[PDB]
Design a protein around this ligand. Sequence first.
Ligand SMILES: C/C=C\C=C\CCCCCCCCCO
Ligand SMILES: [Mg+2]
Ligand SMILES: [Mg+2]
Ligand SMILES: [Mg+2]
Ligand SMILES: [Mg+2]
Ligand SMILES: [Mg+2]
Ligand SMILES: [Mg+2]
Length: 141
Amino acid sequence: TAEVMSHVTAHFGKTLEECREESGLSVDILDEFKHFWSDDFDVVHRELGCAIICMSNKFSLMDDDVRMHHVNMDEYIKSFPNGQVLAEKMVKLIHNCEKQFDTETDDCTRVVKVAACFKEDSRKEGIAPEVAMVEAVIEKY
Ligand SMILES: C/C=C\C=C\CCCCCCCCCO
Ligand SMILES: [Mg+2]
Ligand SMILES: [Mg+2]
Ligand SMILES: [Mg+2]
Ligand SMILES: [Mg+2]
Ligand SMILES: [Mg+2]
Ligand SMILES: [Mg+2]
């Protein structure tokens, strides 16, 4: 659900600044990770794919094939309030989007394509939060 997605986003996004330099993710491409969810942000930059790999690896959320680690991602989502309601559905959505991009050879580009698909399908499923709701939880943890 959208409030659970806001907690996951607010926490995951605390690794954006330490991953900017190695990814080339300029503040002029993305200032605050919460903006990922804005109607007005296109999820397309290779640099953002590279940043998400860096961010994921901080929490062991990707496996050695540079794809989501299903058990670690389930356990991470479940670590937030009401997380069990989102954990299976979010793992499913991400993995269905990874299957659509399996022929992309460039890991950074693949990840950003997976991320855009995940945004699209989260919006369609009614679990995409507003930027305001991520902001409301930024102080936690
Ligand atoms: C994790 C909370 C918000 C994340 C937004 C970026 C979406 C990244 C999902 C893809 C995860 C890595 C899988 C790509 O193979
Ligand atoms: Mg840190
Ligand atoms: Mg680099
Ligand atoms: Mg800022
Ligand atoms: Mg690792
Ligand atoms: Mg684990
Ligand atoms: Mg390439």
